[PDB]
């Protein structure tokens, strides 16, 4: 069932991408929070 | 499931759902810390204790 | 008992714990990012 | 007001405590999720549900 | 000062709430470890 | 006996997450008595 696997792997890759995006966004919010004080 | 294990997409799926879970937790913590900030820096310009 | 240098020090104490929460979350996120790298690696090795 | 809290040094404790509740609530959420994923794992001896959960 | 106590009332009231919570999490946990033999 | 090992794999992740959660809970367990004594 080659393609079924292939499909799941794509879903997994997409899930990583959003995670990565999230990690970036979350960092900026941190940095904004990190500003304001000082 | 047999193929899933041997391909190791099983391990990947599980670690990925776990990482997603953790990331959502960090997002929640970050939102709360955000609300208390932008409220901290706000009481320094003139509720807080009640919080 | 002390005078309102109580103010100043209360503010500083609060700012300090709040910032400490910031660095804790920051650490959390970096750990997540390395786990990310590992998952992406493991995922590059599946045919 | 806050100055009283500081004077009592109940500030330190209230903050640490509220922190502690947040942490306890988070771990509780994790525990709830693990509890169901566990159950569902066990229950399968039902299989469709788990396999659907992984995909 | 008269305030101190009332706030503290809730504080002992909550810390002992948390110990209970932790105890509950530990028993729940033991159940999970049980199920996994 | 193909599936045996996969099922085992899931059970392995579950044992690991269980250990994670328990460790966290015990650290919280330390801070709780610390603070409540403090009072």
Swiss-Prot record, chain A:
It is found in: Nucleus; Cytoplasm; Cytoplasm, Cytosol. Residues 1-38 are annotated as: Implicated in the circadian rhythmicity. Ubiquitinated, leading to its proteasomal degradation. O-glycosylated; contains O-GlcNAc. O-glycosylation by OGT prevents protein degradation by inhibiting ubiquitination. It also stabilizes the CLOCK-BMAL1 heterodimer thereby increasing CLOCK-BMAL1-mediated transcriptional activation of PER1/2/3 and CRY1/2. Expressed equally in brain, eye, testes, ovaries, liver, heart, lung, kidney. In the brain, expression is abundant in the suprachiasmatic nuclei (SCN), in the pyriform cortex, and in the hippocampus. Low expression throughout the rest of the brain. Expression does not appear to undergo circadian oscillations. It comes from the Eukaryota. Induction: In the SCN, nuclear expression is lowest between CT7 and CT13. Cytoplasmic expression is highest at these times. In liver, peak levels from CT21 to CT3. Expression of both phosphorylated and unphosphorylated forms of BMAL1 with other circadian clock proteins occurs between CT15 and CT18. Expression in the heart oscillates in a circadian manner. Disulfide bonds: none annotated. Component of the circadian clock oscillator which includes the CRY proteins, CLOCK or NPAS2, BMAL1 or BMAL2, CSNK1D and/or CSNK1E, TIMELESS and the PER proteins. Forms a heterodimer with BMAL1. The CLOCK-BMAL1 heterodimer is required for E-box-dependent transactivation, for CLOCK nuclear translocation and degradation, and for phosphorylation of both CLOCK and BMAL1. Interacts with NR3C1 in a ligand-dependent fashion. Interacts with ESR1 and estrogen stimulates this interaction. Interacts with the complex p35/CDK5. Interacts with RELA/p65. Interacts with KAT2B, CREBBP and EP300. Contains a Gln-rich C-terminal domain which could correspond to the transactivation domain. Transcriptional activator which forms a core component of the circadian clock. The circadian clock, an internal time-keeping system, regulates various physiological processes through the generation of approximately 24 hour circadian rhythms in gene expression, which are translated into rhythms in metabolism and behavior. It is derived from the Latin roots 'circa' (about) and 'diem' (day) and acts as an important regulator of a wide array of physiological functions including metabolism, sleep, body temperature, blood pressure, endocrine, immune, cardiovascular, and renal function. This is Circadian locomoter output cycles protein kaput. The chain holds residues 519 to 556 of 855 of the full protein.
From Swiss-Prot, chain B:
Signal peptide: none annotated. Residues 11-42 form a coiled coil. It comes from the Eukaryota. Disruption phenotype: No visible phenotype. Knockout mice display normal locomotor activity rhythms and normal behavioral responses to light. Animals show reduction liver PER1 peak levels, but no change in the expression of other core clock genes. Expressed in the heart, kidney and liver and shows a circadian oscillation in these tissues with a peak at circadian time 14 hours (at protein level). Expressed in the brain, including the suprachiasmatic nucleus (SCN) of the brain, and in multiple peripheral tissues such as heart, liver and kidney. Exhibits a circadian oscillation in the peripheral tissues with a peak at circadian time 14 hours. It is found in: Nucleus; Cytoplasm, Cytosol. Transcriptional repressor which may act as a negative-feedback regulator of CLOCK-BMAL1 transcriptional activity in the circadian-clock mechanism. May stimulate BMAL1-dependent phosphorylation of CLOCK. However, the physiological relevance of these observations is unsure, since experiments in knockout mice showed that CIPC is not critially required for basic circadian clock. Interacts with CLOCK. Forms a ternary complex with the CLOCK-BMAL1 heterodimer. Interacts with CAD and HSPA5. This is CLOCK-interacting pacemaker. The lineage of its organism: Eukaryota, Metazoa, Chordata, Craniata, Vertebrata. The chain holds residues 354 to 411 of 432 of the full protein.
């Amino acid at each position: 069932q080659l393609g079924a696997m292939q499909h799941l792997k794509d879903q997994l890759e997409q899930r990583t991408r959003m995670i990565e995006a999230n990690i970036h966004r979350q960092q900026e919010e941190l940095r904004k929070i990190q500003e304001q004080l000082q | 499931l047999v193929v899933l294990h041997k391909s190791g997409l099983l391990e990947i799926t599980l670690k990925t759902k776990e990482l997603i879970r953790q990331n959502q937790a960090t997002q929640a913590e970050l939102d709360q810390l955000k609300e208390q900030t932008q409220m901290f820096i706000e009481a320094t310009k003139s509720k807080l204790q009640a919080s």
